[PDB]
Structure 1
Amino acid sequence: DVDECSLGANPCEHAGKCINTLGSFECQCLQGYTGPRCEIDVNECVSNPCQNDATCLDQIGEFQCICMPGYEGVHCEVNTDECASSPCLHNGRCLDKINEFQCECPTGFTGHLCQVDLHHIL
């Protein structure tokens, strides 16, 4: 037997661990590397994990998503609820949109956030 893990070069790529066997050898790859000699940097983005027009970053052993505005979450799968902070004053009904919200104001109030009091006028 030749110990392939004790020759001039490590036959395993991307710093995989070489393990000698009788008649051959094997590679123990670092996370994110595949192939008999760890030759392939796995594409973690190949199944399109990033949703809603997000950008997928293909990294070592992982992906990361960069979300479009209005979206959040590991997969950009959550439409952020802009109504969650109750931005509409005076019990205005908050309507959630994409990176935006609308307020439907009760009688006597107007403006984007229902700020403007009209009661004195009428």
Structure 2
Amino acid sequence: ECQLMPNACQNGGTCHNSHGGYNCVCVNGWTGEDCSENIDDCASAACFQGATCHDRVASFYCECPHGRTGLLCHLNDACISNPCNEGSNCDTNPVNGKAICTCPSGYTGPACSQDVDECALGANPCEHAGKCLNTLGSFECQCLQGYTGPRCEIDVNECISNPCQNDATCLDQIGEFQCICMPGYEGVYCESGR
């Protein structure tokens, strides 16, 4: 039978064991006795205008130049003109070639060229009655005096500069300090003796 040959009619080819000789009926796209040679669909393909064509089984792949995309690379991709802002990944639709922007954090809109107002989301990120300030693609906290850090969470230690004098104890208070003078001293900074 055809059993003696492990492989005859290689690609979707059905062996026929006729008395005169073996025969192969083959799936479309192949040709030859065993149907081992791929019909060139690129000689008749619709890949055009600089596309590198690659033969597939009853199909073809249009390798596209950079300024084009699609099944046939028949349309230009809008991502070549950089419609999306920096930080946004530009992707191309396979059907129409229109650019699809994926915005980074802080930006929105079709072109991702619009700031998000983080101060207009229903919450104040700033502690201690701080004022949310909107920044292009970001936000900031306008802290009160005595509070710093990105969210106004750190009490400034105004006693860090040692403003009190003559071994006075300095009191770290909100936005100011207070000196407590040793015996025999006076003044806001305990600077005047006796």
| TM > 0.5 | yes
TM-score (norm 1): 0.70
Larger radius of gyration: 2
> 4+ runs of 1 displaced by more than 6 Å?
12-15
1:31 CA displacement: 5.0
Q: Which residue of 1 aligns with 2:145?
A: 69
Q: Distance in 2 between matches of 1:17 and 1:93?
A: 58
Structure 1, unpaired ranges of 5+: none
**1:110 equivalenced with 2:160 (yes/no):** no
Q: Distance in 2 between matches of 1:67 and 1:98?
A: 12
Q: Which residue of 1 aligns with 2:117?
A: 43
When the two chains are superposed, the root-mean-square deviation of aligned CA atoms in Å is: 3.1
1:20 CA displacement: 1.7
Q: Distance in 2 between matches of 1:51 and 1:98?
A: 14
Q: Which residue of 2 aligns with 1:22?
A: 94
* Percent of pairs with identical residues: 39
Q: Distance in 1 between matches of 2:126 and 2:76?
A: 41
Asked if structure 2 preserves the Cα contact closer than 8 Å seen for 1:57 and 1:64, the reply is yes
TM-score (norm 2): 0.48
Where in structure 2 are the equivalents of 1:86-105 lying within 5 Å? 86-105=162-181
Q: Distance in 1 between matches of 2:127 and 2:110?
A: 32
Indicate the structure whose relative CO is greater, using CA pairs within 8 Å and at least 6 residues apart: 1
Q: Summarize the Cα distance change of 1:40–1:4 in structure 2 as closer, same or farther, 3 Å threshold.
A: farther
Q: Summarize the Cα distance change of 1:30–1:4 in structure 2 as closer, same or farther, 3 Å threshold.
A: farther
Structure 2, unpaired ranges of 5+: 1-69
| Number of residue equivalences | 115
